[PDB]
Curated annotation (Swiss-Prot), chains A, B, C, D, E, F:
Superkingdom, taxonomy of origin: Viruses
Subcellular location: Host endoplasmic reticulum membrane
Stated name of the protein: Non-structural protein 4
Membrane topology annotation: Multi-pass membrane protein
Residues of the full protein shown: 3173 to 3263 of 4405
Record function comment: Plays a role in the formation and maintenance of double membrane vesicles (DMVs) replication organelles. DMVs are formed by nsp3 and nsp4, while nsp6 zippers ER membranes and connects to lipid droplets.
UniProt source species: Severe acute respiratory syndrome coronavirus 2 (2019-nCoV)
Record domain Nsp4C: where: 2-92
Assembly and binders: Interacts with PL-PRO and nsp6.
Length: 92, 92, 92, 92, 92, 92
């Protein structure tokens, strides 16, 4: 929801406390979290074959991917939203 | 539209070329641009009396305000999105 | 003192060690720390009704507020100084 | 050379003066500049099918691409190095 | 004054308009601007031989130096405050 | 190696896990890590008397210094690469 979407655009320390709040915020709707993990791969390595390059949607996937890596690590990491681009915004 | 909303979240050089592309993107719908200028003052000086503090909505107002200041200046300025806050995202 | 004032302008990981060093640096003078907490709310939600908007003073309040939130949390957070603004520096 | 490689890692205002200094620095060796433009597309959209993801090499391509866009625009833009990633540095 | 001191801590586009406002703000007191240029050299290359390493004072010198380079160039540049350091703040 | 060199250019949370991966990456070659610690002092305080100011080499020293401070502290810190400078890249 809002919490996750707005958090995906921030730079923050991803730790147990933060992982809990953001991961919970995307438990519902159900398929929500898995869709963002499916799109991370496209948005990161196969951006060329994408007829939708929403920056917010990209950020949500970058955060989802980060929560996932943390769920298999427990090691705190600095989360950073994906690089913005004014030339990318003017081109759709 | 998307261009403006996505641009409001970037850090870029606001010059004539950029002012034209972003200002045009918010000519329609009509009241769009004026609403963002009305909300800028609330989001900046009267945040306390607001039962809606969407970060994206805040960014759109910060950019609208920037385009306005540029329309009465012609002097290029570095645009920067408003400060993010993970504690603000977890608090509604 | 200097340590706190200079720290309020940095981006750092606020943890127990750092909380101890900065909170100690503002134990004296006595009313120092409480004044910065009183001003945080003005600088954040009631900026309009303020005939003094010193950026350094704003940063000191943002840090004081951060130390306070940490004293009731123990959870490490990334501290970030408040958004700067060249248009704010030229306007008094 | 050094100037371009080191500049590709900085955040600066790309204008005529800067375009001249950096573009000149990559006139020699000859194929240098064209190779960086060929690699930009891979790094940006086809990163998945790439058995070499040097961050410095990525930055050089991002800057080359920026000089190119400027050569067909004359409009000053803020240049920003590509997003860094500690998780990308530990994975080769 | 305040304008210059507060500006020295911001990231902004240094152009004719901005150069005029900030350079004027340090015309008085008289020796003000020249002292900051004398200290830039120490703060940048001879930091070791300094019994005073105030970050704000360092920023003021970095900005003074920037205004000077601009006075002999007319070419707009992105100004950036000097790197902050929490380990530098805790050590005086 | 690549891991350390590329990491020295990133902004990340330096913790036990990260300290282990980066410190290991510079165990070999042998004198590697000690040379970067010797150069840190020059780059930070005696930059003036230095006929080699490679930014990457500077970053490697800033990271080496950070790993060292962490080896005698165990307290997680946010690592930040040294301030970049386009005016420094055009001057060798
Ligand atoms: Na939800
Ligand atoms: Na529109
Ligand atoms: Na004190
Ligand atoms: Na060359
Ligand atoms: Na890599
Ligand atoms: Na003055
Ligand atoms: Na090695
Ligand atoms: Na250099």
């Amino acid at each position: 929801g809002s919490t996750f979407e707005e958090a995906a655009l921030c730079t923050f320390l991803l730790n147990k406390e933060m992982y809990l709040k953001l991961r919970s915020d995307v438990l519902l709707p159900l398929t929500q979290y898995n869709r963002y993990l499916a799109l991370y791969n496209k948005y990161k390595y196969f951006s060329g074959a994408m007829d939708t390059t929403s920056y917010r949607e990209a950020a949500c996937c970058h955060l989802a991917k980060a929560l996932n890596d943390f769920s298999n690590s427990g090691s705190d990491v600095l989360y950073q939203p994906p690089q913005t681009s004014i030339t990318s915004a003017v081109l759709q």
